[PDB]
Design a protein around this ligand. Sequence first.
Ligand SMILES: [Ca+2]
Lengths: 125, 98
Amino acid sequence: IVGGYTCAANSIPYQVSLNSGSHFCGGSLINSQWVVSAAHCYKSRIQVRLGEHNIDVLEGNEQFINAAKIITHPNFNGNTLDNDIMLIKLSSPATLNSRVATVSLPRSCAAAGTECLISGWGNTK
Amino acid sequence: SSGSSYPSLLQCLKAPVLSNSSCKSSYPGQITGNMICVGFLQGGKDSCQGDSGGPVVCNGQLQGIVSWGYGCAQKNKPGVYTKVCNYVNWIQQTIAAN
Ligand SMILES: [Ca+2]
């Protein structure tokens, strides 16, 4: 995130960190059993980390569960990046609590000018 | 904008959904109906490498997935996101079958 600010600890409870040795991509918990992400983030082995704020320290509120199934969209296109979505099923259901919560899917599409909040541990420069 | 540095702490950014003409003006012949632009045309505020797959939540609903762009925070190159509102059925269908 370039030009952003540091989020309040656990203020984005649906934010997960995809880990394969180190954090490589973000994701969102939309179900106690399912995480949604970007198909271009695909790796055959992935560990999902929930309840994270500082990815470099065990603060205590984290739950690490390996993905059991990773399903990218059948029409995902690597050239155009059309249908850049992937679903990940956890091997064990996450325990929903204060620092770990699901995010609602959309009721409808958003009108232009709608303010949104974007988060992640990506490059800041 | 220039350089590199992946944070240990979670970063946030408030940005508005851009109209598809503004989105389409920035990337001629490359924006599909399954894509939306969110951000600022002036640059300086954007998602980047490592934020991929991350949430774009507006009004309590997940409207986007960090997908792509030309670099990060470039003037007139806002970020492009997967349009989640077009995928609810696939997501429900998939969760039911697996
Ligand atoms: Ca931590």
